[PDB]
């Protein structure tokens, strides 16, 4: 009928009907889309039809064993054997810890939108597949956070909860990411904190969470175990490391009173592997300066500090042609970079990050002739062509294992 | 078998075999590709099979008449009538000047990679469909250049040459764009001028053109009429307007001795309309600062002036983390912007350009529910998310009329 298109800046939606008048086979490309269904793995009422599960399981087990040098044919056949048996006896199966570890790295390895993949093999894996209660999820999450934070020297880690069984016993973190500041609709009409979390904030308020009406209040974990309703757990403040923003030259920068958390951790994605699905497996890497400096601090729909930094710098805030924005954003970026460095908190600039990826990609093509890459996400939000990845053509395809997006829980979940 | 992937920075090529292990239907996306076959319209040995031509012609004629308010049904039917007749009598047909004008604007209108489309209706159209000789093409081109340049106050224009008949009587400009600086492989091993034109430069040398071994030597027009070999015509220097680069603060900027031409004009694209094809129809708009400031002056494979500007600014050229590149590029951009303004030569900054497009797109959706847009090209090479189009999701599809790319002539042409 038509295609929905959204502008994440103004929120506005548009209906496209023109593509119907398109020509032959051009490569309606849905690449500019944030959350396309092709990248989402949703709900389920019943187990995974054995006819499907078994083949995938086999492939996976073949990938795993085909991995290490100097094969283990016997172990391989036996595993292939043991796995089939377990499936026709249980209607599913359990991966060996090693398979898990292998799975999570390869999934990371196949994340087309991840620019830090040269680190793919460095990943701590916490096995919480035996978790059973919400409170137990909380403890696990707290442990993850403490380990990954490591007092500023960030470590990449992922904690894997129980796999989806029937489809109505899903463990799931309702949060987008582990640490995230709340956004409130103030009474005077203004918005305080992160405007991007307005709804989810309300959701937490609706679940009995007490708002602190601040600019940087760390939201609570909203966990749901097995299938039960979600329970709210506040994050122990001693566990949330932060960096206060300051510029190495403009002493008025700190007057802005900005800061950001040091831990970037995905909370709501799904890990598909060998037919198995893990609807709850939070993971983290470390930050790239521009995420905070450009996206978090300069997006219109976020903290939007660009004009304020402009005026303070004495720029011509009323003349786009003056390129005052290009100037301000660069200083905000140096502040972020500077502040993290001064406080000994791992971070990387987008230039070294870009080169890093290029080396990864070339290593990746040699080792296995390819590397799924989504240019639209790999090119930084500033200084695009000043970066190597901008001039690199790339193919974006979905392999397996893979980290998928999922439909927001509060939408498809009955209490 | 595999897909070829190129890095326009190092020139290196890579073969991708992994996509074969892809999953279901994700939206191997070939969006990161510069010149995909889907966007190219190539050669032909014989006329256009009437079975194909006729239907397209009808559609087009229906688009044209369905255009203006208060229809002209009689004229429409008659035109539909007259056109069919002409086709079964000639094996082709001629568009009325108006249809041409309508065609070229709609083609511009359907250019997914053009950011200046809010200007789509402002286009001067020179009708050279009666051209017959190379020298005649030259005169026409000179006229175009003089009109468009307009002493700095740039005007958008397109000159349409004779349509492809049999397929072996193609009028074609061998140049990428009308004005373009030559790049020479110097004897001492270094490269002078625009390294991007090294081959084409050689081609001109091979055609009897005398190299001037400079940094900014305007290359000659290499025209081919009907089907004959290409003839070389040098461009009258009085016709090539230039802007010498200078910074509004660093007086040493001009010491760099940089300059660029004021006229951005496409020379090698094809105009498809109603089954008809025009393999030669150069057109021009005006510049967006970043094209010169970022691409032309800072690409590694181009003039590559980034480090030099860095040192002169006193930056930490040996520490990526210092973000010295983000600083230099911004000053280069202001120089370009400043220099064009000071010399009264039309130009637009990428911010006003970005807003301009957003307004176009919204107007476009209301008027005809859609606007083909290629995000990868619409987002500037710097300050991406500081721009509105970065947050706008968009669909990229090929309509008609349309401006296609073509296979480089020197590859498929016999002397
Ligand atoms: C070692 C440090 C790492 C760095 C520097 C890094 C950096 C990044 C950055 C900059 C993005 C873009 C975020 C955005 O634009 O919103 C991203 C996306 C992504 N990363 Fe990484 N990453 C790292 C580790 C990991 C790990 C350990 C995993 C998983 C095991 C991972 C999985 C992903 C996925 C799936 C995405 C896409 C997320 C989405 O679509 O929202 N990354 N990463
Ligand atoms: C009024 C001024 C105009 C401006 C400001 C403008 C600007 C631009 C810019 C900045 C690009 C990107 C170039 C690059 O990244 O290499 C572009 C591409 C394009 N423009 Fe426009 N344009 C204008 C007029 C036109 C006109 C008059 C036509 C045709 C009738 C046109 C057709 C196209 C096409 C086909 C492309 C894609 C070219 C390619 O794929 O290489 N533009 N334009
Ligand atoms: C997911 C992408 N992403 C990563 C990831 F998957 C894995 C490992 C990482 F190190 C990162 C990272 N370096 N940033 C985020 C994106 C920024 N994110 C946030 O906290 C967000 C803050 N505000 C947002 C908004 N609107 C979105 C995300 C942290 C994870
Ligand atoms: C085509 C895209 N393009 C336009 C276009 F189609 C139509 C109208 C325009 F105003 C522009 C424009 N504003 N720049 C170029 C791209 C830059 N180009 C050049 O001269 C190039 C210089 N160096 C290059 C390299 N390598 C490529 C192009 C001028 C036309
Ligand atoms: C609409 C557009 O896809 C979206 O705003 C962008 C594009 N590319 C991105 N790139 C990264 N790395 N992260 C993002 O959030 C986005 N968002
Ligand atoms: C490989 C990549 O597609 C290429 O280097 C880019 C991307 N987007 C672009 N965007 C514009 N406007 N112009 C360009 O030359 C390019 N080139």
mmCIF file of C-alpha atoms in Angstrom, chain A residues 3-9 12 14-36 38-39 41 247 294-295 298-301 306 320-323 325-327 329-331 333-334 337 341 349-352 355 358 361-362 364-365 368-377 379-386 388 390-400 404, chain B residues 3-9 12 14-36 38-39 41 247 294-295 298-301 306 320-323 325-327 329-331 333-334 337 341 349-352 355 358 361-362 364-365 368-377 379-386 388 390-400 404:
data_model
loop_
_atom_site.group_PDB
_atom_site.id
_atom_site.type_symbol
_atom_site.label_atom_id
_atom_site.label_comp_id
_atom_site.label_asym_id
_atom_site.label_seq_id
_atom_site.Cartn_x
_atom_site.Cartn_y
_atom_site.Cartn_z
ATOM 1 C CA UNK A 3 5.944 2.642 3.109
ATOM 2 C CA UNK A 4 6.232 4.492 6.413
ATOM 3 C CA UNK A 5 9.246 6.751 6.781
ATOM 4 C CA UNK A 6 10.358 8.483 9.958
ATOM 5 C CA UNK A 7 12.475 11.492 10.807
ATOM 6 C CA UNK A 8 14.109 10.778 14.161
ATOM 7 C CA UNK A 9 14.753 14.476 14.544
ATOM 8 C CA UNK A 12 7.395 13.286 11.893
ATOM 9 C CA UNK A 14 5.729 10.322 5.927
ATOM 10 C CA UNK A 15 3.907 7.865 3.669
ATOM 11 C CA UNK A 16 5.653 6.978 0.427
ATOM 12 C CA UNK A 17 3.555 5.882 -2.556
ATOM 13 C CA UNK A 18 5.919 6.922 -5.366
ATOM 14 C CA UNK A 19 8.154 3.851 -5.188
ATOM 15 C CA UNK A 20 5.297 2.018 -6.943
ATOM 16 C CA UNK A 21 6.288 3.900 -10.085
ATOM 17 C CA UNK A 22 9.844 2.544 -9.775
ATOM 18 C CA UNK A 23 11.572 0.855 -12.713
ATOM 19 C CA UNK A 24 13.303 -2.534 -13.089
ATOM 20 C CA UNK A 25 15.606 -4.156 -10.532
ATOM 21 C CA UNK A 26 17.725 -1.444 -8.921
ATOM 22 C CA UNK A 27 20.242 -3.519 -6.893
ATOM 23 C CA UNK A 28 13.066 0.662 -3.234
ATOM 24 C CA UNK A 29 16.164 0.281 -1.050
ATOM 25 C CA UNK A 30 15.370 0.295 2.671
ATOM 26 C CA UNK A 31 18.928 1.063 3.792
ATOM 27 C CA UNK A 32 18.220 4.479 5.321
ATOM 28 C CA UNK A 33 15.865 2.682 7.736
ATOM 29 C CA UNK A 34 16.738 2.377 11.422
ATOM 30 C CA UNK A 35 14.739 -0.660 12.513
ATOM 31 C CA UNK A 36 13.705 -2.644 9.414
ATOM 32 C CA UNK A 38 14.594 -7.731 8.174
ATOM 33 C CA UNK A 39 16.793 -6.858 11.154
ATOM 34 C CA UNK A 41 13.477 -11.128 15.419
ATOM 35 C CA UNK A 247 37.321 21.589 28.207
ATOM 36 C CA UNK A 294 27.946 14.654 18.693
ATOM 37 C CA UNK A 295 24.874 12.476 19.158
ATOM 38 C CA UNK A 298 24.237 17.904 19.908
ATOM 39 C CA UNK A 299 21.207 16.071 18.573
ATOM 40 C CA UNK A 300 18.166 18.339 18.506
ATOM 41 C CA UNK A 301 16.116 15.557 20.137
ATOM 42 C CA UNK A 306 25.091 23.369 20.328
ATOM 43 C CA UNK A 320 24.701 29.207 9.184
ATOM 44 C CA UNK A 321 27.257 30.151 6.516
ATOM 45 C CA UNK A 322 29.763 31.045 9.240
ATOM 46 C CA UNK A 323 30.087 27.327 9.995
ATOM 47 C CA UNK A 325 28.274 24.670 14.239
ATOM 48 C CA UNK A 326 31.319 22.910 12.775
ATOM 49 C CA UNK A 327 33.392 24.861 15.253
ATOM 50 C CA UNK A 329 30.926 20.512 17.772
ATOM 51 C CA UNK A 330 34.651 20.121 17.439
ATOM 52 C CA UNK A 331 35.225 21.748 20.849
ATOM 53 C CA UNK A 333 34.269 16.564 20.999
ATOM 54 C CA UNK A 334 37.622 17.592 22.435
ATOM 55 C CA UNK A 337 37.807 13.133 24.690
ATOM 56 C CA UNK A 341 41.340 10.829 29.293
ATOM 57 C CA UNK A 349 38.418 9.058 18.944
ATOM 58 C CA UNK A 350 36.536 8.419 15.710
ATOM 59 C CA UNK A 351 39.683 8.665 13.552
ATOM 60 C CA UNK A 352 41.659 5.957 15.303
ATOM 61 C CA UNK A 355 41.482 3.163 10.938
ATOM 62 C CA UNK A 358 39.733 -0.721 8.137
ATOM 63 C CA UNK A 361 37.915 -5.513 7.524
ATOM 64 C CA UNK A 362 41.068 -6.306 5.574
ATOM 65 C CA UNK A 364 38.399 -10.261 7.853
ATOM 66 C CA UNK A 365 38.441 -10.551 4.049
ATOM 67 C CA UNK A 368 37.112 -15.533 5.458
ATOM 68 C CA UNK A 369 36.598 -13.468 2.316
ATOM 69 C CA UNK A 370 34.145 -10.893 3.586
ATOM 70 C CA UNK A 371 32.866 -8.726 6.408
ATOM 71 C CA UNK A 372 29.284 -7.553 6.704
ATOM 72 C CA UNK A 373 29.394 -3.761 6.947
ATOM 73 C CA UNK A 374 26.677 -1.098 7.102
ATOM 74 C CA UNK A 375 28.334 2.069 5.754
ATOM 75 C CA UNK A 376 25.511 4.270 7.062
ATOM 76 C CA UNK A 377 26.413 3.275 10.619
ATOM 77 C CA UNK A 379 30.782 6.439 9.040
ATOM 78 C CA UNK A 380 30.986 8.832 12.072
ATOM 79 C CA UNK A 381 28.404 11.624 12.574
ATOM 80 C CA UNK A 382 31.180 14.177 11.827
ATOM 81 C CA UNK A 383 34.204 14.406 9.541
ATOM 82 C CA UNK A 384 32.865 11.555 7.390
ATOM 83 C CA UNK A 385 35.170 11.643 4.371
ATOM 84 C CA UNK A 386 38.104 12.703 6.561
ATOM 85 C CA UNK A 388 38.927 5.925 5.705
ATOM 86 C CA UNK A 390 33.870 6.711 3.946
ATOM 87 C CA UNK A 391 35.819 5.728 0.812
ATOM 88 C CA UNK A 392 35.383 2.022 1.370
ATOM 89 C CA UNK A 393 32.552 0.291 -0.484
ATOM 90 C CA UNK A 394 30.902 -2.409 1.581
ATOM 91 C CA UNK A 395 28.261 -5.123 1.560
ATOM 92 C CA UNK A 396 25.662 -5.397 4.290
ATOM 93 C CA UNK A 397 24.241 -8.899 4.809
ATOM 94 C CA UNK A 398 22.774 -10.836 7.744
ATOM 95 C CA UNK A 399 24.705 -13.995 8.665
ATOM 96 C CA UNK A 400 24.322 -16.263 11.730
ATOM 97 C CA UNK A 404 18.863 -9.015 16.198
ATOM 98 C CA UNK B 3 31.217 -9.431 -5.702
ATOM 99 C CA UNK B 4 33.924 -6.876 -6.452
ATOM 100 C CA UNK B 5 34.329 -4.105 -3.906
ATOM 101 C CA UNK B 6 36.490 -1.022 -4.292
ATOM 102 C CA UNK B 7 38.108 1.465 -1.957
ATOM 103 C CA UNK B 8 38.244 4.782 -3.802
ATOM 104 C CA UNK B 9 40.895 5.932 -1.377
ATOM 105 C CA UNK B 12 42.409 -1.475 -3.707
ATOM 106 C CA UNK B 14 38.364 -6.913 -2.610
ATOM 107 C CA UNK B 15 36.402 -10.023 -3.578
ATOM 108 C CA UNK B 16 33.462 -10.892 -1.353
ATOM 109 C CA UNK B 17 32.346 -14.525 -1.110
ATOM 110 C CA UNK B 18 30.752 -14.432 2.356
ATOM 111 C CA UNK B 19 27.422 -12.973 1.244
ATOM 112 C CA UNK B 20 26.656 -16.471 -0.089
ATOM 113 C CA UNK B 21 26.220 -17.535 3.526
ATOM 114 C CA UNK B 22 23.603 -14.798 4.016
ATOM 115 C CA UNK B 23 20.198 -15.576 5.525
ATOM 116 C CA UNK B 24 16.629 -14.891 4.334
ATOM 117 C CA UNK B 25 15.404 -11.683 2.695
ATOM 118 C CA UNK B 26 17.130 -8.738 4.363
ATOM 119 C CA UNK B 27 15.227 -5.760 2.858
ATOM 120 C CA UNK B 28 23.480 -8.358 0.117
ATOM 121 C CA UNK B 29 22.643 -4.650 -0.139
ATOM 122 C CA UNK B 30 24.669 -2.850 -2.810
ATOM 123 C CA UNK B 31 24.012 0.649 -1.458
ATOM 124 C CA UNK B 32 27.609 1.484 -0.524
ATOM 125 C CA UNK B 33 28.453 1.058 -4.227
ATOM 126 C CA UNK B 34 29.413 4.060 -6.350
ATOM 127 C CA UNK B 35 28.566 2.909 -9.867
ATOM 128 C CA UNK B 36 26.211 -0.093 -9.658
ATOM 129 C CA UNK B 38 21.388 -0.792 -11.771
ATOM 130 C CA UNK B 39 22.286 2.890 -12.111
ATOM 131 C CA UNK B 41 22.537 2.651 -18.989
ATOM 132 C CA UNK B 247 41.291 32.606 4.538
ATOM 133 C CA UNK B 294 36.435 18.603 1.920
ATOM 134 C CA UNK B 295 36.485 16.335 -1.121
ATOM 135 C CA UNK B 298 41.228 16.947 1.629
ATOM 136 C CA UNK B 299 40.729 13.589 -0.044
ATOM 137 C CA UNK B 300 43.893 11.502 0.127
ATOM 138 C CA UNK B 301 43.501 10.690 -3.586
ATOM 139 C CA UNK B 306 45.129 18.479 5.263
ATOM 140 C CA UNK B 320 44.850 11.656 15.837
ATOM 141 C CA UNK B 321 43.153 11.976 19.236
ATOM 142 C CA UNK B 322 43.804 15.727 19.204
ATOM 143 C CA UNK B 323 41.167 16.041 16.477
ATOM 144 C CA UNK B 325 41.898 17.107 11.311
ATOM 145 C CA UNK B 326 38.446 18.268 12.428
ATOM 146 C CA UNK B 327 39.999 21.652 13.041
ATOM 147 C CA UNK B 329 39.013 20.922 7.579
ATOM 148 C CA UNK B 330 36.760 23.480 9.167
ATOM 149 C CA UNK B 331 39.206 26.295 8.332
ATOM 150 C CA UNK B 333 35.817 25.086 4.477
ATOM 151 C CA UNK B 334 35.594 28.662 5.709
ATOM 152 C CA UNK B 337 33.120 29.755 1.504
ATOM 153 C CA UNK B 341 31.677 35.134 -1.317
ATOM 154 C CA UNK B 349 27.223 26.054 2.744
ATOM 155 C CA UNK B 350 26.239 22.474 3.533
ATOM 156 C CA UNK B 351 23.950 23.490 6.423
ATOM 157 C CA UNK B 352 21.708 25.809 4.446
ATOM 158 C CA UNK B 355 17.770 22.547 5.301
ATOM 159 C CA UNK B 358 14.455 18.981 3.787
ATOM 160 C CA UNK B 361 11.447 16.673 0.285
ATOM 161 C CA UNK B 362 8.460 17.710 2.376
ATOM 162 C CA UNK B 364 7.765 16.717 -2.770
ATOM 163 C CA UNK B 365 5.858 14.264 -0.556
ATOM 164 C CA UNK B 368 3.354 13.606 -5.232
ATOM 165 C CA UNK B 369 3.789 11.425 -2.158
ATOM 166 C CA UNK B 370 7.485 10.678 -2.368
ATOM 167 C CA UNK B 371 10.982 11.774 -3.300
ATOM 168 C CA UNK B 372 13.739 9.388 -4.298
ATOM 169 C CA UNK B 373 16.659 10.055 -1.958
ATOM 170 C CA UNK B 374 20.062 8.400 -1.529
ATOM 171 C CA UNK B 375 21.060 9.140 2.083
ATOM 172 C CA UNK B 376 24.670 8.096 1.445
ATOM 173 C CA UNK B 377 25.038 10.959 -1.029
ATOM 174 C CA UNK B 379 24.615 13.601 3.914
ATOM 175 C CA UNK B 380 27.654 15.979 3.646
ATOM 176 C CA UNK B 381 31.240 14.664 4.001
ATOM 177 C CA UNK B 382 31.494 16.569 7.330
ATOM 178 C CA UNK B 383 29.196 17.408 10.236
ATOM 179 C CA UNK B 384 26.748 14.688 9.159
ATOM 180 C CA UNK B 385 24.372 14.495 12.116
ATOM 181 C CA UNK B 386 24.707 18.244 12.714
ATOM 182 C CA UNK B 388 18.807 17.552 9.241
ATOM 183 C CA UNK B 390 21.088 12.682 8.634
ATOM 184 C CA UNK B 391 18.024 12.025 10.818
ATOM 185 C CA UNK B 392 15.678 11.639 7.887
ATOM 186 C CA UNK B 393 14.933 8.108 6.693
ATOM 187 C CA UNK B 394 14.598 7.888 2.936
ATOM 188 C CA UNK B 395 13.821 5.572 0.042
ATOM 189 C CA UNK B 396 16.073 5.336 -2.984
ATOM 190 C CA UNK B 397 14.343 4.202 -6.189
ATOM 191 C CA UNK B 398 14.876 4.767 -9.919
ATOM 192 C CA UNK B 399 11.954 6.465 -11.686
ATOM 193 C CA UNK B 400 11.768 7.896 -15.236
ATOM 194 C CA UNK B 404 21.859 7.464 -15.755
#
